[PDB]
Amino acid sequence: RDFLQLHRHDSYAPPRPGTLARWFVNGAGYFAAVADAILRAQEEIFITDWWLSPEVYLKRPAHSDDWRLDIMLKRKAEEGVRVSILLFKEVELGINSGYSKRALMLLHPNIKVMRHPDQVTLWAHHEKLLVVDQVVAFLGGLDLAYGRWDDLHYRLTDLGDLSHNQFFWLGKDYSNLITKDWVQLDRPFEDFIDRETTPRMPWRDVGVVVHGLPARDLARHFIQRWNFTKTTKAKYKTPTYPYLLPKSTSTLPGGQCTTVQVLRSVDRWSAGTLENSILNAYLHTIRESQHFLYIENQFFISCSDGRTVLNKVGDEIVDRILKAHKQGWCYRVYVLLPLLPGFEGDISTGGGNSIQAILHFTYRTLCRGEYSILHRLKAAMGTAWRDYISICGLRTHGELGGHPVSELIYIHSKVLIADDRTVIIGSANINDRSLLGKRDSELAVLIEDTETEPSLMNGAEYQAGRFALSLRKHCFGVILGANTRPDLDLRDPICDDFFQLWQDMAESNANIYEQIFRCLPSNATRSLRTLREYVAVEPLATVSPPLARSELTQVQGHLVHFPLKFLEDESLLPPGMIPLEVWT
């Protein structure tokens, strides 16, 4: 179909039936498939990134320069492939887009990088994209950047010429984002945290590859941004940055046949035009969902008040739950969030003001004030709200220094699954910054199944979609620990037995982690003053590692309940002249 008019959900691109699409959970498979695709490139590679680490290794463990992103692009450029890269130009964050740019363009003249914007603004280019020959396109939450590679093992430690290398995360790739922010990125092979005393923060994310027509659509977005960016400053207007043009006619890993629609958030400042089709697709999927929602997102800032927060995603969730309760439907909403925002902050002091600002708007959405999801649900249905929504996070544990250590798994995914039939995957967080269009630029794909699998839904036979069911089962299996308990029935995602098991695990795990590590966040610290005395106590993990180790044997999976009462007696907003909407 055409691009002369707008389409479903007011998107620039129509839905593409018969699209091969494959989802990825965690960075390990995404970066491997990116590496394989780069190797087979014949003409063009398009890349957009919020952050691009040139020296990141795409396959692990590294034994040579092969599979290192910069080396792979240099090799393809030497065969005549044109690499075009759109990088976010941060306000000197410490991501050093200048080093990424200078390093990539030093490699070969066939690699061209533009940065945007030049003008001062609060907003960023957030989309993550890699397109090969305008026929294969990767998108999702994963930047080609440090800290993103991980796998189901979610290793907390990495203790062991690279021919005999055993580290999975070399140098700057080994990090704990909450402990300390990245420094000295022009020294990629230098550690910046103590590998022997400070555990990794595991990184969880979701990506996707699409083939055919939706890859053309994503390439067309890149081309518009590329040619628009050309007009943004004199240096880029010169012929050394060629105009790009989309392929039009006659449009490989292992994907699933689905209907895929590309979606994006863009504005005048970020592109030629206004669009917020990710938001529209989010709302419509919630409105039309019939059985359950699974939401895994880095942020959860919503519930409009007309002033500070504007998007209506939370309101749609509330309306669906209120309707399910009114009609007597079995309906479940699963919300998976990172236990703490991804900023550098000593949580034992209370967290930085960035952490506190996000928590304010997160808790305003979840359970605090007249607009919160739980307050409107509680008002209508009392304690029955627990039958309809579950808010959880992830945590794991390991061993370091001869005693157990624990850290949350950072949920960076931006995925929604509905009814085991529909999936949204992209870069768009659930907040005003990602969804309004006017602010950050974002990408997403709407994936609707056309092929089905026999499954269950509240005890009844149910034809689930192949792409959506496999993703949801893979998420559920890793999160709840299905490897260790092969008796788990993950066919039915909404029946009482399974929903109870989900909540029971969340409560059981959260209690053990709190008993062993006294980890934050926690329901046991309702104010900063009780927080100050609470952290002055040495946890059992270090008091008696053997006793700690024994009790940790009862943890199943990584699922922990998201503590809704952490610091609930504090205002949490910082005082001051900064607009509050920087964080929303």
Ligand SMILES: C[C@@H](CN1CCC2(CC1)C(=O)NCN2c1cccc(F)c1)NC(=O)c1ccc(Br)cc1
């Ligand atoms: C989890 C992350 C943080 N999130 C990034 C993505 C974030 C929100 C914050 C988003 O979700 N949208 C826009 N945005 C953002 C961020 C910073 C400036 C800006 F202008 C926009 N930490 C790291 O990966 C990270 C990497 C390098 C450095 Br140094 C610092 C952090």
